[PDB]
Amino acid sequence: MRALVTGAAGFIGSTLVDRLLADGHSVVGLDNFATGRATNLEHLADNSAHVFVEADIVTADLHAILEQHRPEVVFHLAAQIDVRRSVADPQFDAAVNVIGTVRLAEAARQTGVRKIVHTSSGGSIYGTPPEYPTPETAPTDPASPYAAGKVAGEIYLNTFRHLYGLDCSHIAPANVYGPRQDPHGEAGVVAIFAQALLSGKPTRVFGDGTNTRDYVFVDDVVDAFVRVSADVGGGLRFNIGTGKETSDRQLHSAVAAAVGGPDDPEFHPPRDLKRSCLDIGLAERVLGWRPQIELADGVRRTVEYFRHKH
């Protein structure tokens, strides 16, 4: 197929690009390098099945771009990703995550795109639900502008599906980690620990360390994107996680084990959600998707990546 990936210069985006190319697709990458990195895509310099477009989804002529490249599927991973930044500037977050998505859908419905695969946020859209692991049927209850914008994006895409029959599905990842993750933000805690411990710099667990997340390896997430790109799961969100809860403290230990040396983090005052754990049954039933990579193994893979960057 012809694929276009927004946020292609990013962690998950560049990984998806690699997978799509490996599957024999042509891939157009799109990014404004808000948080992305040229080094994430540099290996594709002489790959003729890949084309890169520098564009800001907020202001670029997405109509002209999609008219030119005629993607069959648009994989939408471009977003303002930082929860804290979304609180400091909800307008900016909403412009990128809501307006950006709307502009893309409006362009795609006019240019013969079959499907948009949106990226939601499994870790934040549910707020604090009464069910863990959390199924997609649980009500959204966003507690940050970031989370609200992700929900709004889902809803707008569902709307375009009604209006025009532009298909859509929402990939809602838990806590994604792995090679290429930027050691920054509360998202990149695996990267932060790996880089710091490898350096022998201090590491900080914010709170008593009991807070839990659902850690899913980037390759598993990418495979979900590929699966859902088909004519399946229309207008549906898919939780993409492992359905296992790992405490902040336990995560440190897993990274410490991989790195070697001391497992002795600093404990800081609490900064946020106490638990996150996704029910991944729908993805199995509908897409045949299961995560392949368990935490200890994934962390070793991730630490291996950071070893060579250090």
Ligand X SMILES: NC(=O)c1ccc[n+]([C@@H]2O[C@H](COP(=O)([O-])OP(=O)(O)OC[C@H]3O[C@@H](n4cnc5c(N)ncnc54)[C@H](O)[C@@H]3O)[C@@H](O)[C@H]2O)c1
Residues of the binding site: 11-12, 31-36, 56-57, 77-81, 121, 146, 150, 175, 189-190, 204-206, 213, 271-272
Binding a copy of itself (rule: CB under 8 A), the pick from 9, 16, 27, 147 is 147
Q: Choose the contact partner of 241 out of ligand X, a copy of itself, none; CB within 5 to 8 A by kind.
A: none
Q: From the CB of 192, what's the least distance to a copy of itself, in Å? A: 24
Site string for ligand X, 129-168 (x = CB under 6 A): ----------------------------------------
Alpha carbon 93 to chain centroid, angstroms: 16
**Is residue 103 helix, strand or coil?**
helix
Residue type, 18: D
Report the residue number, 144 or 169, with the smaller CB distance to a copy of itself.
144
Contacts 24+ apart (CB under 8 A), 292-297: 292/217, 292/219, 292/220, 292/223, 293/216, 293/217, 293/219, 293/220, 294/242, 295/215, 295/242, 295/244, 295/246, 295/251, 295/254, 296/254, 296/257, 296/258
In this structure, the number of other CB atoms found within 10 A of the CB of residue 236 comes to 17
On the 0-12 / 13-18 / 19+ scale of CB atoms within 10 A, 217 is buried
| CA separation for the pair 242, 279 (Å, rounded) | 8
Q: Select from 28, 34, 128 the least CA-distant residue to 70.
A: 28
| CA separation for the pair 173, 240 (Å, rounded) | 5
Binding ligand X (rule: CB under 6 A), the pick from 33, 87, 131, 165 is 33
Q: What residues numbered 208-237 form the site for ligand X, per CB under 6 A?
A: none
105 binds ligand X (CB under 6 A): no
Report the residue number, 56 or 106, with the smaller CB distance to a copy of itself.
106
Annotated catalytic residue 215: no
Q: What residues numbered 80-99 form the site for a copy of itself, per CB under 8 A?
A: 87, 90-91, 94-95, 98-99
Instruction: Give start and end residues of each alpha helix (H) in the chain.
Output: 11-22, 62-69, 83-88, 90-94, 100-108, 145-164, 189-199, 218-228, 248-259, 281-287, 295-309
105 binds a copy of itself (CB under 8 A): yes
Site string for ligand X, 1-30 (x = CB under 6 A): -----xx-xxxxx-----------------
Q: Choose the contact partner of 64 out of a copy of itself, ligand X, none; CB within 5 to 8 A by kind.
A: none
141 binds a copy of itself (CB under 8 A): yes
**Is residue 306 helix, strand or coil?**
helix
The binding site for a copy of itself (CB under 8 A) comprises 87, 90-91, 94-95, 98-99, 102-103, 105-106, 127, 140-145, 147-148, 151-152, 155-156, 158-159, 162-163
The binding site for ligand X (CB under 6 A) comprises 6-7, 9-13, 31-36, 56-58, 77-81, 96, 100, 119, 121, 123, 173, 175-176, 182, 187
Residues annotated catalytic, as ranges: 146
